Amino acid sequence: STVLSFCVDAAKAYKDYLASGGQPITNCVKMLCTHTGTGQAITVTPEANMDQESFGGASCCLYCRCHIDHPNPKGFCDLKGKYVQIPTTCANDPVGFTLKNTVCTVCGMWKGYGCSCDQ
Amino acid sequence: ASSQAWQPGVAMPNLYKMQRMLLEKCDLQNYGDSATLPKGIMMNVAKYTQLCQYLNTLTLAVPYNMRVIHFGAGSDKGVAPGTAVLRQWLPTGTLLVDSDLNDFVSDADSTLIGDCATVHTANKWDLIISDMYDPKTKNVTKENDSKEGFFTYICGFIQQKLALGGSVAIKITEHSWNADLYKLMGHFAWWTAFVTNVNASSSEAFLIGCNYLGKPREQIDGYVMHANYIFWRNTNPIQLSSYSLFDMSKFPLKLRGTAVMSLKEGQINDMILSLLSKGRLIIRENNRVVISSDVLVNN
Ligand SMILES: C[n+]1cn([C@@H]2O[C@H](COP(=O)(O)OP(=O)(O)OP(=O)(O)OC[C@H]3O[C@@H](n4cnc5c(N)ncnc54)[C@H](O)[C@@H]3O)[C@@H](O)[C@H]2O)c2nc(N)[nH]c(=O)c21
Ligand SMILES: C[n+]1cn([C@@H]2O[C@H](COP(=O)(O)OP(=O)(O)O)[C@@H](O)[C@H]2O)c2nc(N)[nH]c(=O)c21
Ligand SMILES: Nc1ncnc2c1ncn2[C@@H]1O[C@H](CSCC[C@H](N)C(=O)O)[C@@H](O)[C@H]1O
Ligand SMILES: [Zn+2]
Ligand SMILES: [Zn+2]
Numbered sequence: 001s002t003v004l005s006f007c008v009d010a011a012k013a014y015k016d017y018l019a020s021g022g023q024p025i026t027n028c029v030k031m032l033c034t035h036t037g038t039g040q041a042i043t044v045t046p047e048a049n050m051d052q053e054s055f056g057g058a059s060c061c062l063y064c065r066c067h068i069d070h071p072n073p074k075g076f077c078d079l080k081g082k083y084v085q086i087p088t089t090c091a092n093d094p095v096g097f098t099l100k101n102t103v104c105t106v107c108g109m110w111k112g113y114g115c116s117c118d119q
Numbered sequence: 120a121s122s123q124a125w126q127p128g129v130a131m132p133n134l135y136k137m138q139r140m141l142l143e144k145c146d147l148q149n150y151g152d153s154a155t156l157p158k159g160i161m162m163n164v165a166k167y168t169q170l171c172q173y174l175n176t177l178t179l180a181v182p183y184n185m186r187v188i189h190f191g192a193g194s195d196k197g198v199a200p201g202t203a204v205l206r207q208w209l210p211t212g213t214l215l216v217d218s219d220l221n222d223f224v225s226d227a228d229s230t231l232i233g234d235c236a237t238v239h240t241a242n243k244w245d246l247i248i249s250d251m252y253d254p255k256t257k258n259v260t261k262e263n264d265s266k267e268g269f270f271t272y273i274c275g276f277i278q279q280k281l282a283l284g285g286s287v288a289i290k291i292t293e294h295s296w297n298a299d300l301y302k303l304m305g306h307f308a309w310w311t312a313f314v315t316n317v318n319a320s321s322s323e324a325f326l327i328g329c330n331y332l333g334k335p336r337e338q339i340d341g342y343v344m345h346a347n348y349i350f351w352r353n354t355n356p357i358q359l360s361s362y363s364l365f366d367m368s369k370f371p372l373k374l375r376g377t378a379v380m381s382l383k384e385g386q387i388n389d390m391i392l393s394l395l396s397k398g399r400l401i402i403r404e405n406n407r408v409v410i411s412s413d414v415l416v417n418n
Binding site: 007010014027028029031032033034046053056057058061063064065067080081082091106 | 158159160161164166168196197198199200202203204206207211214224225226227228366368370371383
């Protein structure tokens with residue numbers, strides 16, 4: 001409880017690092033792909049559309065890249081072993097994008113970057 | 120641009136394999152030159168993409184629940200670009216295990232950190248990829264002789280852990296090579312030394328063994344074959360090219376559902392060898408995949 005109560009919050013700490021002009025985490029692995037994919041956020045294979053870039057999941061995960069526990073009772077990673085689609089306009093900071101945005105449980109598209117379930 | 124510029128790379132032509140050259144120093148006309156890669160694409164993503172594009176033209180065995188192990192998967196970046204490409208290429212659900220002397224984060228199902236000699240497994244594999252390279256290889260002080268180190272482990276791993284019908288792609292260079300590994304290429308239905316077009320300016324090649332037969336099909340002298348490889352590279356300049364990276368429509372490995380069967384060594388007849396030689400058969404048990412990393416206990 002005292003270790004859990006104390007624990008880190010690496011998520012907000014990254015936005016603060018970027019806010020203070022910190023260089024975004026590099027070496028996210030960009031894949032070669034057709035760019036005619038479904039455009040869904042996190043997929044078993046690259047699914048980038050004409051407006052996205054596909055990256056190896058583990059390399060875009062703050063917790064994987066910083067070697068720190070994942071925020072989940074099971075410590076399950078949502079990116080590792082998968083491919084994350086990042087809008088070309090945000091492709092310079094894939095770690096920042098996956099942290100700041102959430103996936104739509106219904107259509108699998110990024111909320112605010114592909115999900116149109118709300119009209 | 121030559122016809123080979125639209126290919127993912129160039130394989131060592133058969134007539135060069137049949138020579139008896141003496142080892143000479145490798146001297147590439149474009150040595151060091153860097154390829155013009157698509158924007159933001161890493162050299163190792165391009166290299167592995169071209170290797171996979173070339174493996175798509177071979178008779179690889181592709182069984183359900185395929186088993187692939189990738190040695191030398193880590194980079195100085197702390198990530199695994201090659202593993203990302205292999206997982207993109209391999210059918211979904213393929214068990215992909217990777218390893219490296221140094222720590223790194225990977226998309227592999229399981230990752231083992233430590234010298235490849237500390238990696239153990241009773242299970243057999245369908246495909247072995249090695250990108251291992253000893254940094255000390257750059258220290259060229261003595262004659263260019265057959266190298267041991269990880270090559271000794273790779274040869275033993277192929278002999279004891281590769282399923283019959285399985286294939287391998289093992290990275291070599293002018294100075295990073297092993298005579299026994301070349302001799303082992305003679306235990307496959309077919310083999311070659313493949314050069315990626317994005318790294319045409321390097322002596323690097325992938326030694327590819329296609330469909331393991333577990334017995335010699337042809338006798339290969341490793342010292343002579345490496346000399347033949349360098350003669351080929353020294354007399355056939357390859358123009359740097361990234362052209363094949365732009366068409367990824369047929370990139371994924373075709374799921375062939377290759378049959379997997381258990382057979383005693385006495386049951387391996389000519390009809391079975393014929394099936395192995397066409398990528399239509401994998402011989403191994405279908406038991407649970409268990410791997411381990413030896414840990415040295417010290418004060
Ligand atoms: C082929 N070649 C080798 N050398 C000389 O011999 C040395 C050893 O030769 P090598 O066996 O390392 O081969 P080569 O130089 O072709 O390898 P290269 O550096 O292109 O590396 C190939 C791949 O190996 C891996 N690699 C190389 N260096 C490292 C490293 N330090 N750490 C990890 N991986 C590495 C990478 O995947 C890389 O793409 C070279 O460092 C150089 O002085 C040459 N010199 C001239 N002038 N012309 C040549 O054509 C030539
Ligand atoms: C790429 N490849 C070449 N060979 C052998 O080499 C022969 C021809 O080699 P090639 O380079 O494919 O020549 P070609 O297509 O211009 O005729 C084949 O018919 C096989 O005997 C091969 N044999 C097997 N088993 N598997 C392969 O993937 C393979
Ligand atoms: N004996 C050994 N056991 C395990 N890994 C080894 C080794 N000798 C060299 N290596 C590894 O071989 C690698 C060569 S560089 C590998 C690059 C990687 N395939 C990529 O996709 O970018 C290094 O990471 C080095 O640590
Ligand atoms: Zn993670
Ligand atoms: Zn939605």
